[PDB]
Design a protein around this ligand. Structure first.
Ligand SMILES: OC[C@H]1O[C@@](CO)(O[C@H]2O[C@H](CO)[C@@H](O)[C@H](O)[C@H]2O)[C@@H](O)[C@@H]1O
Length: 618
């Protein structure tokens, strides 16, 4: 290619007043972008032609970036998302406050909680009919009418931004709704857009891929491939049948998606949850996951953002085994130049496992096996979310090692399914071992306690819930609270009586916000008020501990008491966790300390059942 030629295409649509800063960033990241793109599409006859054109469109989008956001681009500090005041909150805009304007009216609630990061679930145009809770996107550039307009989105981000809250939005970049403008163009016979997806005239290729492909909905939707009349072909569909996998091997797809992303950024979104990002690249003979190219694709999108909107962050999802997570942060030449965040799905699943089995040693294993985060990278740590808990990511760990004996994922799954006598949990099986649905409060024993009017059990359960969250709060990066958990909200059986949802078990833990329950957060004596106060405590404390910043180290101290989990941050902070229902103490000699206690140390630390203690070493 011809660098000066490509740079000129990019510049040009730029405003003379901002041309200097942008061209400066373009000069330091462009090469990475170009190398990534070349490895992906360099062999194509129309490469150089597409690049130049595309680059010209990237520059025009760069010019349209509102001044306030450009200023943010220049003032924001790298690794900003990893500061100790960062607290995350995830929820559906509709379940939470009806519309985007309604959500804006609720910002005072988020501010009171201490939220600085707000993830709104899919809110862009979704397929008519069932749209997988918004995950079948029909237009990446338009808010879903029932939720509002693009104007409300902009007004919302401006409101959140002044409250120090960064909007995280889903970029469902692996697949589109089958009614997206592209699928409709494809369905109409437009070969150009038909090529934006994976399509096959026969069952030939599908049969092959299926030989080594796993399944996301083995029961509900063995839909991994679908025959579509309109296109007269088999369409790759990893998820529901109406969600078509995009063909990222086509530069057109890459170019249009990078643009879509930059337009969202321009509307004020600061963080992009790259949904199903492990499935991006398809290659025969492979499970088509975590492929090397998927990573190159991410490096490219990352370069595009470093140049056009550096204040923006990319968060990888990927529900995969531990060894597959860290590479989303970039590898070798590209380490530190891929995703800034990754959901620590292993830590989260390991937490519920540790709780059911009353084994702190399982958490020690996860942390010990958690490699140190690269420069300006961090974890998205969490307790629950809109999805089912995927246990199978803990297979390797379940096998056990020299320090930790084996554990049964099957036993854990049954415990939370309440298919085993004595269980305080009330969840359900989703799709052998696979997944479990249910609210945190429902899994922690709170729902069962309330169900039986047993105050003793309720308190113990509150402890279990707080325990799990204390861990996420002690982690380097963004601890994401799932809507309602701060009030101990329980399951929502309502979907069962709904022909539109009864088929999707995950609705069990996707309730509408209980604002009357929210008002109780004040009555310190109420359950909600109690849970809310305990969490609020840990949040205010973590905000005051520079030792918890993402740049500080994360490690765990090996103990011979299987029930305890000792987590350390930097060299001055240690959090002790008792995952058993038994009172016990941790000897200071077992952690090499002798000091302070957070929101006084001389002798072992006594930890009640399911208790947590934060201490400042020394
Ligand atoms: O069983 C859940 C299955 O789907 C995943 C993909 O990583 O979830 C994300 O993407 C789905 C399809 O777009 C959404 O339905 C889901 O809500 C979203 O979190 C994983 O949770 C898991 O592999």
């Amino acid at each position: 290619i011809d660098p000066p030629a490509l740079r000129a295409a990019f510049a040009g649509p730029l405003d003379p007043q901002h041309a200097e800063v942008l061209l400066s960033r373009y000069d330091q990241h462009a090469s990475r972008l170009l190398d990534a793109l070349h490895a992906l599409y360099g062999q194509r006859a129309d490469y150089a032609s597409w690049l130049a054109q595309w680059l010209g469109e990237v520059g025009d989008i760069a010019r349209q970036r509102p001044q306030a956001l450009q200023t943010l681009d220049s003032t924001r500090h790298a690794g900003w998302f990893g500061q100790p005041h960062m607290l995350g909150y995830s929820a559906y805009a509709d379940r939470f406050a009806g519309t985007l304007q309604g959500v804006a009216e609720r910002v005072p609630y988020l501010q009171e909680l201490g939220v600085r990061y707000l993830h709104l679930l899919p809110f862009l145009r979704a397929r008519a009919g069932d749209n997988d809770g918004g995950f079948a996107v029909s237009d990446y550039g338009q808010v879903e009418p029932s939720l509002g307009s693009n104007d409300d989105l902009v007004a919302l981000t401006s409101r959140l931004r002044e409250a120090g809250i960064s909007l995280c939005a889903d970029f469902v970049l692996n697949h589109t709704a089958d009614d997206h403008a592209w699928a409709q163009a494809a369905r109409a016979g437009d070969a150009r857009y038909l090529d934006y997806y994976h399509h096959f005239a026969d069952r030939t290729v599908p049969d092959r891929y299926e030989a080594t492909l796993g399944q996301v909905f083995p029961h509900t939707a063995p839909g991994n491939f679908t025959w579509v009349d309109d296109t007269a072909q088999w369409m790759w569909t990893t998820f529901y049948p109406y969600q078509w996998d995009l063909n990222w091997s086509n530069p057109a797809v890459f170019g249009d998606m990078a643009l879509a992303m930059l337009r969202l950024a321009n509307l004020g979104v600061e963080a992009f949850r790259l949904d199903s990002t492990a499935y991006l690249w398809k290659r025969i003979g492979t499970d088509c996951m975590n492929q090397s190219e998927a990573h190159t694709l991410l490096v490219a999108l990352r370069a595009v953002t470093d140049i056009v909107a550096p204040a923006v962050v990319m968060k990888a999802q990927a529900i995969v085994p531990m060894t597959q997570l860290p590479p989303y942060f970039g590898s070798g030449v590209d380490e530190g130049h891929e995703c800034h965040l990754a959901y620590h799905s292993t830590l989260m699943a390991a937490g519920w496992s540790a709780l059911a089995l009353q084994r702190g040693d399982i958490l020690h294993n996860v942390i010990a096996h958690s490699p140190p985060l690269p420069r300006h990278c961090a974890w998205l740590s969490y307790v629950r979310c809109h999805d089912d808990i995927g246990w199978n990511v803990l297979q390797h760990e379940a096998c056990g090692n020299a320090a930790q004996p084996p554990f049964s994922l099957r036993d854990v799954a049954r415990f939370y399914a309440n298919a085993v006598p004595g269980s305080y949990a009330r969840g359900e099986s989703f799709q052998g071992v696979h997944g479990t649905n249910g609210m945190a409060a429902a899994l922690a024993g709170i729902q069962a306690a309330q169900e039986a009017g047993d105050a003793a059990a309720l308190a113990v359960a509150v402890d279990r819930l707080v325990l799990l969250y204390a861990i996420a709060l002690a982690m380097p990066g963004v601890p994401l609270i799932y809507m309602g958990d701060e009030l101990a909200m329980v399951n929502d059986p309502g979907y069962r009586d709904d022909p539109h949802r009864q088929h999707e078990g995950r609705w069990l833990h996707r309730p509408a916000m209980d604002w009357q329950l929210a008002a109780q957060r004040h009555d310190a004596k109420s359950l909600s008020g109690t849970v809310y106060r305990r969490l609020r405590g840990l949040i205010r404390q973590r905000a005051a501990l520079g030792a918890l910043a993402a740049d500080q180290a994360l490690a765990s101290i090996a103990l011979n008491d299987p029930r305890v989990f000792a987590l350390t941050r930097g060299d001055s902070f240690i959090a002790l966790h008792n995952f058993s229902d038994q009172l016990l103490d941790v000897e200071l000699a077992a952690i090499g300390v002798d000091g302070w206690t957070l929101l006084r140390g001389d002798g072992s630390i006594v930890l009640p059942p399911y208790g947590v203690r934060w201490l400042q070493r020394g």
